[PDB]
Amino acid sequence: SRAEDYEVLYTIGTGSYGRCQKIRRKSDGKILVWKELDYGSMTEAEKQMLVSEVNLLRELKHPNIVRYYDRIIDRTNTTLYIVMEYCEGGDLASVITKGTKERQYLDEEFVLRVMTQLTLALKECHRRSHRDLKPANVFLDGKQNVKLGDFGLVGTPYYMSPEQMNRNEKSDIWSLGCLLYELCALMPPFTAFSQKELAGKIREGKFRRIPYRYSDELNEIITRMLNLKDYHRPSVEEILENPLILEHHHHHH
Numbered sequence: 001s002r003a004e005d006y007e008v009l010y011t012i013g014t015g016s017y018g019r020c021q022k023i024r025r026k027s028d029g030k031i032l033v034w035k036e037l038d039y040g041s042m043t044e045a046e047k048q049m050l051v052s053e054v055n056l057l058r059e060l061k062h063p064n065i066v067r068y069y070d071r072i073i074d075r076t077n078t079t080l081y082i083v084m085e086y087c088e089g090g091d092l093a094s095v096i097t098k099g100t101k102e103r104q105y106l107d108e109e110f111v112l113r114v115m116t117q118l119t120l121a122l123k124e125c126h127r128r129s130h131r132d133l134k135p136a137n138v139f140l141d142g143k144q145n146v147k148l149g150d151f152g153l154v155g156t157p158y159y160m161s162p163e164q165m166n167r168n169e170k171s172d173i174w175s176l177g178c179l180l181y182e183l184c185a186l187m188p189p190f191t192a193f194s195q196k197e198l199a200g201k202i203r204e205g206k207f208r209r210i211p212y213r214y215s216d217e218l219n220e221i222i223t224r225m226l227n228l229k230d231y232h233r234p235s236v237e238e239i240l241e242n243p244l245i246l247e248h249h250h251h252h253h
């Protein structure tokens with residue numbers, strides 16, 4: 001459990017937060033990644049909070065939750081390393097953006113994967129009661145698995161549920177609703193330039209149908225998650241009972 005145990009291959013992302021690197025475990029050669037965080041400029045409280053958060057990541061083990069492996073302390077450089085599984089496919093935001101650029105929609109089969117495995121991510125999270133559902137916090141591994149990251153655990157809040165927007169597990173369904181709709185449409189269900197305009201549209205509750213390449217069945221379910229009334233949204237359970245969702249849409253080792 002020392003930085004010396006891993007070798008850095010190269011950097012994937014920079015912050016902000018700090019830095020994310022693809023690394024290799026020396027004992028076996030397993031490819032992982034770790035988040036870098038320089039805690040040198042933090043008070044004692046912030047550091048007790050940070051330690052508080054990290055103890056959480058150690059608790060969740062689930063095939064659709066980005067897997068925590070290790071936490072490494074380097075008091076020399078005041079650097080904290082959080083080591084996790086490598087998700088070779090990246091985040092969903094990039095996939096959506098890529099989709100926007102080369103003007104190519106994604107396959108319904110892919111949406112069904114994301115819909116299925118993330119609904120199971122939720123179901124796990126609600127049970128342990130968190131993480132927030134947005135493209136940036138959703139990762140893909142090398143095996144068509146879909147994993148939820150730790151974000152949440154200036155910009156327009158596109159995914160804000162009608163009830164929040166105000167003063168609930170059903171609020172999460174809405175957010176998931178917005179995420180799949182964006183995966184299909186390559187754009188959020190409600191767009192605007194100001195939050196106030198946004199708010200006005202969300203209270204109206206209208207949006208385009210997702211593209212016609214997507215089945216009425218898919219459209220209907222996403223549409224149901226975007227229902228203005230929280231109690232009309234399908235629960236995690238009604239989502240999974242849907243005829244669209246099959247075994248091969250689940251995670252695989």
Ligand SMILES: C[C@@H](Oc1cc(-c2cc(-c3cc(CN(C)C)cs3)cnc2N)ccc1C(N)=O)c1ccccc1C(F)(F)F
Nearest residue numbers: 012013020033066085086087088090091136139149150151
């Ligand atoms: C800050 C960071 O956080 C997370 C990163 C990962 C994660 C990302 C990746 C990526 C692979 C690639 C493709 N590359 C081959 C070109 C782009 S990103 C690989 N393994 C990972 N474990 C997973 C979870 C989190 C998290 N915060 O929970 C993050 C977040 C969003 C987008 C990029 C990053 C980055 F780049 F810093 F890792």
